[PDB]
Every structure is written in C-alpha cells, then in structure tokens.
C-alpha cells in the first residue's frame, strides 16, 4: 500500500531536470502513474503496466530502457471504491463528489477515470535546454490542448497537503486518448460517461536522487505553493 | 538507506496521540530512533538496536511488545561521515559546524552525539487522557530536565524544510543518560568532549496509521511550522 515518489515538486521548480531514475526500473515500484521525463521532454503517464511519453507534437511513444526522470509517482493500482458517472460533471463538482466519499482527507489515492469527457485541456511540457530556468518560468510557453467528446483515460494521485510541495497536493491527473497518441498534463475537464476507480494508499515512499544537480539546489521557496498552483493548475 | 517516519507531525499537534504502530515492529525499520508513545506517555529513544521509554517520572523502561507510538522515527544508522569534539561547544556553534560540512541541505540525516556535555536540557511529554488538546496546550506544563556533567548519548534527526509538518525540519534530538535512566526531547546542550556521528538518507517513508483518530483529523493548521517551533 505504497506511492512511490520519486524526487520533489520544489526540486522541479527550481529547474532540477534531470533526474538519475531509470524508468526501465518502473515494474519494481508500480503499474500505474505520472510524472514527467529528464528535461521536461514530455509528459509521463500509464497504468495496467503500459508507460507513455506524451510530447507536444501530438505522439505518444512508449517508455524505453534508458529513459530518466527527475520527477514521478508510481503504484500498484488495486480497485479498492468504484463510482460510475453518467451525467455531465465540470472538474469542480467531480472534486466536491469525490472528496465526499473519500474514508479520509489524510490518506493518499491513486485515482482512474475511464469513459467519454465532454472536454480535456491539457499541457504538455517541452524539451528544455541548459542552462535551465525555473518552472514557472518553463511553462509560460507551455502547449495548451482542449479535446471535445473525447474518449480515454485520466490517471493520478491525490495528495494531502501535508505532502505539499514533495508532491503536488490535491489532484494531480494526466490524461490519454482511447487512440494512445494524445494527452498529458490535465487542467480541466468535463466528464460525461465515466467509471472513476480509486485506490487507497497508506504509504508514501520519497526517493532522493544522487545528482549533484539535487544536492546543490536552492529548494528554499516561501512561496512554493503558489508556485505550483502556476505550474500545475 | 531510509528513514521510516511513522505518522505526521501536524497529526500530533492536533492532539493525535493515539497511533496503531506497534513498536515491537521496529527491528524491521531500524536500531535508531527517537519519538513518542501513544498518549504522549513519555519520549521514545534509542540506538544500537536498544529503546527505552523516557518518562518523567525520572525512568527508563525498555520497549515492550505492546507499545504504541503516534509519531516516531527510526534508521539504520550508518557512520558516513565521525569528527572528535575535544573543547567546548554550544549548541548554536555544533549547528553551524555541522551544517557547513553537510553535503547539502535538501537530504536526510541521522545524528549521534557520544560522550561528556558540560549541559543538557530536555523535556518529556507525560501521558494524556482524552479528549485531547492540542500539542502546543499539552506542553505548557511539560517537565523539564537539567543536566551538567553529563555523559550520555544524543541522537535524533535532520530534516530538510520541505518535510517540515511530516517531520521536525531542522534538527530534532533525544538524550539518555549513560545510567539509562534519565533524558527526553533535547531543548539545549553544551558538548564538552564528544564524538559526533552522521548519517546520510536518501529515501524517507512515510507510514499512515489505520485509526479513526487519523482518518478524522482535520489537519489544516497554516501555523504548524511555527506550532512545530513552539512544541519542538
Ligand atoms: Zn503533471
Ligand atoms: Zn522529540
């Protein structure tokens, strides 16, 4: 019963891009999960084993040996509530209707939407070159995409905010088209036709990477959550 | 290379005093450690594989099967990195020297200090009944204890801030008196003639209890860090 969290939201906002995570190691820690990839190339999602690199340019390729991450959560996903939606639901009702049956705030989820959204907007960051700069900086130019009556499937976590900036508190969702080529990072949506599956996770695993890039970084940000509010929503 | 943290530090500033980890698990997790025990009865110490309770009643009791924690946290400590104290040394002036030779900031550490401390001195937490109040009321009358010319052991801690509120961030130190009778919650030292020993964590997991208690905290509080200051 474990979120595997590999690195901090504060150490990517700092510009720490490049991680030392081989995602080959992914089976070792989960079947489900997001993040992104070293130099922000694209946005990470997957889940029933199967990992995606979504970039900007409309393609999702597989995750391969060799590919690094200074930032992701994984887990294995088990079932543990089921909730069908079958009405158009906007992305604050869906957060008031979940939080109302969640056992707890304090806890961590792992969470599944699977169906027809009647809109997803969502980013997906890009290749970023040394020297790096901030993230809010990063994603001032960040490709924004909206999809209407989409089919696919959202996955994410859903953190408390004592974890506020290790992990993103709230939901964090990425999205993937039922094609397999389109998505990423989600800022809004609409549901239409949906079953939402939730995992309850007890435990929550930060690994640190061995990177001078982390050790020598400034995480010292008073206004951090702001900062991921900017990045992140 | 972890640190197992059981439970949050703003759960036990809300009065979540009850958890359901058992401490006869420990072995598993660590032989080094500091925290609490369910309802605050008493500081929880130990290295070398060997934990004691602290109450302030002026014992040390051995940890039994049994024993409950809310908070605590455990390693298995590592010497990575041992320097000798030979003069006096103030707690501000064993800070700064150990931070300046931390290889950074944002990793965890575990600290142990051996030897004479020209002073010490320490609380510990005395057992609540429910219904409980909050951390910074508990400890308003907590007991303190002085110590000068004292042999014993320190241990405990270092967190980097973005841990703050699951954690104590910054340092966070335990005392037992070489008799093993004597100790708590570290407010203040003086080294006299010490060996200092670290260890450096990658990896920190953290583990939610099972209870109503937890699950119905309401753990908002945009003042823990410094209810965090106040308590620790
Ligand atoms: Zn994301
Ligand atoms: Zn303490």
């Given at each position: ?35 992104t990839f070293?130099?922000l190339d694209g946005e990470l999602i ?7 690199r979504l970039r900007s340019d409309g393609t999702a ?61 969502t980013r997906t960051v890009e290749l ?11 994603v001032?130019?960040q490709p924004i995409f ?28 990425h999205f993937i ?5 389109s998505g990423g990072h989600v800022f ?46």
């Amino acid at each position: 019963s474990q979120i595997y969290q590999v690195s901090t939201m504060t150490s990517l906002l700092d510009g720490v891009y490049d991680g030392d995570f081989e995602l080959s190691e992914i089976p070792k820690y989960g079947d489900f999960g997001i993040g992104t990839f070293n130099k922000l190339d694209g946005e990470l999602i997957g889940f029933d084993g199967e990992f995606y690199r979504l970039r900007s340019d409309g393609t999702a390729t597989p995750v391969q040996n060799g590919d690094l991450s200074p930032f992701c959560s994984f887990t294995f996903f088990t079932p543990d509530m089921t909730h069908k939606i079958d009405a158009k639901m906007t992305r604050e009702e869906f957060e008031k209707e979940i939080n109302s049956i969640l056992p707890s705030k304090n806890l961590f989820y792992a969470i599944r939407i699977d169906g027809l959204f009647k809109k997803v907007q969502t980013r997906t960051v890009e290749l970023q070159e040394k020297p790096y700069v901030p993230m809010v900086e990063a994603v001032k130019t960040q490709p924004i995409f909206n999809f209407d009556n989409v089919r696919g499937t959202i996955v994410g976590f859903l953190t408390p905010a004592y974890a506020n900036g290790i992990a993103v508190s709230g939901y964090h969702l990425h999205f993937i088209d039922e094609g397999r080529n389109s998505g990423g990072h989600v800022f809004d949506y609409v549901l239409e036709d949906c079953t939402v599956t939730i995992s309850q996770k007890m435990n929550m695993n930060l690994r640190l990477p061995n990177t001078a890039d982390f050790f020598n970084a400034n995480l010292d940000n008073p206004d951090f959550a702001k900062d991921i509010e900017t990045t992140e929503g």
